Structures are given as C-alpha cells and as structure tokens.
Amino acid sequence: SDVEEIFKTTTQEVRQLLRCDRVAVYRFNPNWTGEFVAESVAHTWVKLVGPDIKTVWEDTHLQETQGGRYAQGENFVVNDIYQVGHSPCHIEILEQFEVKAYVIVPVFAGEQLWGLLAAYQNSGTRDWDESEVTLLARIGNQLGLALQQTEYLQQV
Ligand SMILES: *[C@@H](C)[C@H]1/C(=C/c2[nH]c(/C=C3N=C(/C=C4/NC(=O)C(CC)=C4C)C(C)=C\3CCC(=O)O)c(CCC(=O)O)c2C)NC(=O)[C@@H]1C
C-alpha cells in the first residue's frame, strides 16, 4: 500500500522529532477497535506492528470511549502514568512496552477521525512542552490532509 509507505515514513519522521523510541499509528475500525497499522521502533527496543506481539492482557481503549476525547479533538498529555493516576491494569500494559510517558493525538483525515498517533519513550516523569505537542498534533493533521489526496489519486 502506497498510503502505508507514507505512514511508515511519517512514524520514523515524527519519532526523530520528539526523540521517541517507537511510534504507533492506530486505525479506528468501524467497530472502534483501532489496530496499529503502521509503527516504527529503534532496533534496540520491541515493536508493536507484529503478529508475535504478546501483551499481559489484550486491551482496546478505543471502543469504550468510541473516540471520545480524541474524537472531540482534544489532545491528552501524560507526564507520568503513576503521577496522573492511570489505571494499574493499563499501566502494566504500558510498562511492558516501556511506556511511562506519552502524548495522545487524534489523526483526523477527511471529515472524520481516521487514526491515533502514539509518541513515547522510556521517560518516566518527564514533561511535554506545548511547543512540541502542537507539532505532534500538526503531524497528524498534515497526515490527514495527505491521506485525503492519496485517497483519490490512488484509484481502483
Ligand atoms: C486495563 C488495561 C483495562 C483498561 C484500561 C484502560 N486502557 C486505556 C487506554 C489505552 N489502552 C491501550 C492498549 C494498548 N495495547 C498495547 O499493546 C499498547 C502498547 C503499549 C497499548 C497502549 C491503548 C492504545 C490505549 C489508548 C491510549 C490511552 O492511554 O488512552 C485507559 C486510559 C486511562 C488509563 O488509565 O490509562 C484505560 C482506563 N482497558 C481494558 O480493556 C482493561 C480492562
């Protein structure tokens, strides 16, 4: 898929921007499961887009909220998962993939929410400057605009 090529390049691009270890792009399914279709990670960590992904327990967040906050267009910034009071159930999943600090950005493409962008890297109780958060939400928007162009010019 030519569109996937763009995603795979964008994941790597934004990974360098926020100095993340891995960047996963979810795709909101019509059933709101939201699977990771494109992801990139440094060769020294673990991947996400793999058929051999073993998680402590399977968890979809996207159906329960059905986009919710992210569908509303609000960003979510997590300085630390133990600090904000995250669910221990999700924390165990997060820490299993070295996720202690992260920022959630919704990827609108077209008229509605297409995917989800996850940026993080073994930071712990770090901070996210708004000037860097706006850039991440900018990448998602730019991707959505591109995605629209590729949607037509792809043809069948
Ligand atoms: C414990 C897991 C119960 C639960 C809680 C819960 N989950 C979220 C948010 C997300 N969970 C995601 C799932 C995965 N799977 C992976 O392999 C992976 C890579 C590390 C992740 C992140 C997921 C993508 C999200 C969305 C990102 C987000 O944090 O919103 C939340 C949010 C609040 C919190 O406490 O973290 C909750 C409450 N969900 C279940 O299904 C379990 C019963």
The domain ranges of the chain are 1-156
Would you state the structure tokens that stand for residue 150, as one six-digit string?
């590729």
Would you state the structure tokens that stand for residue 119, as one six-digit string?
């940026």
Which atom of ligand 1 is least distant from the CA of 97? 20
Q: How far apart are CA 113 and CA 147, in angstroms?
A: 12
The correct CATH number of 1-156 out of 3.40.640.10, 3.30.450.40, 1.10.1060.10, 3.40.50.720 is: 3.30.450.40
Closest CA to 87 of 59, 49, 122, 106: 59
Closest CA to 105 of 85, 125, 135: 135
Q: How was this structure determined?
A: NMR
Q: How far apart are CA 89 and CA 4, in angstroms?
A: 31
Q: In the Cβ-directed half-sphere of 103, how many Cα atoms lie within 13 Å?
A: 26
* Residues lining ligand 1, Cβ inside 6 A: 48, 55, 59, 61, 86-87, 89-90, 93-94, 97, 99, 104
Q: What is the distance in A from the centroid of ligand 1 to the CA of 18?
A: 22
Q: How far apart are CA 43 and CA 39, in angstroms?
A: 12
